[PDB]
Design a protein around this ligand. Sequence first.
Ligand SMILES: CC1=[NH+][C@H]2[C@@H](O1)O[C@H](CO)[C@@H](O)[C@@H]2O
Length: 494
Amino acid sequence: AEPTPLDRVIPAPASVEPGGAPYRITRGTHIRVDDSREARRVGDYLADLLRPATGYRLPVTSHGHGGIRLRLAEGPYGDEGYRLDSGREGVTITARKAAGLFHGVQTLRQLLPAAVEKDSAQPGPWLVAGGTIEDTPRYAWRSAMLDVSRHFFSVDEVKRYIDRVALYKYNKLHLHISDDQGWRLAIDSWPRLATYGGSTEVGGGPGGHYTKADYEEIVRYAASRHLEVVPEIDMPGHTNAALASYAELNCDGVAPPLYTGTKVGFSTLCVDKDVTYDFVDDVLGELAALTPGRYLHIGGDQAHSTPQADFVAFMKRVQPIVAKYGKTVVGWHQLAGAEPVEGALVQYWGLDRTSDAEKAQVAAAARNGTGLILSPADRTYLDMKYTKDTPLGLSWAGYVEVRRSYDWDPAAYLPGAPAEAVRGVEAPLWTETLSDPDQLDFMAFPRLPGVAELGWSPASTHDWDTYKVRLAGQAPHWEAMGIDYYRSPQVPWT
Ligand SMILES: CC1=[NH+][C@H]2[C@@H](O1)O[C@H](CO)[C@@H](O)[C@@H]2O
């Protein structure tokens, strides 16, 4: 009978001005896109979302009057923002670019009743609160990571996770496609990596890998949901799958057995063998050809078997290879202490218990111009248990309930780091313990939207007490969408 309030959206929109009567979507509603082919793709995506639960035809049309209009226009919304106007006559989403229209659609779906997400016809009514939202993002780096190395996830399961992150306006998908327990991408020049290095996973199950066509399909689908794919080939540590596949990559020339455990820090590429850099060049060159995004993530975490000076020598030689293939380096924050090249970004995954000296090394790099991606392990690691009783996940970084994950400020977080060095945030989901897509959802939700809100919303909107009510408001939508989630006692679920 009553619309959801115009402000009950995550991320919190930059500006919300409620007023006037709601729009009611009915069988006469059309989706109008004018003559833009870019807007027509967004219109078709919206019609796909709405047709099952409404049962309405919802034709996507160039001309029309009233109804839902998606309009590309010059305006003050940048590359990702939009304005959404709703009243008795219709709803109009205006933006500079298709990504902004797409973000406005993600808001519109949160404004609609939870039953709109159902996959068969529902009664409605389909109300959208009256007023105007004007919305633009705080940070440009708003990313979610999936580890498909520890347990492998199929192309369709990666698409499903893309659809989860698209709900909350993430714009980057970091795929961790190599580790000790699996190598997940076909490399034509090193064909044993995928067939043998991809042949298993944590726990000894059958593993799998993406053919180049599978990977292209993941990239294409991600782009259709306005996610830029950031692939990671972790080096020089976390390389057992590669080392097990090619004896010659090992310092002693002996291939180790495939690894199906969960320990870390034991593996290393051979920093002083020429073949090591031919291998990296070949692999990063093939990956670049599949990567229309700007970045290649070279990892750099837990190289505990690589002495410091060898780690530095290795990264000095590898960073220029990323440049050669026309991309920007991203590494885990161990790179900060190993001469990051100009323009390289580092991903901070430390926690409150990380040494002060280690924090200061990252802060010094930031002060020196190195951009920071924040993903603290005791804040935004979605594989981290909520409490001691969580049946999945890890607790190496302690326990991370919903409020802990949300309630901090990226601009005022790492001591000594300039706020302008912070490019944004990431919510990584590591998979030592997760082996099916429902377990992924149970650990991703309900913290995933909170990290998206950190990336997107203005600092002035940040407030746990009001955010938790917006978060409780998502639960019926997730139930209609088939998403399992942790029902935290911190959140006032209805
Ligand atoms: C960057 C980073 N290195 C470690 C750490 O994060 O924790 C993950 C599990 O939470 C683990 O899988 C990974 O090897």
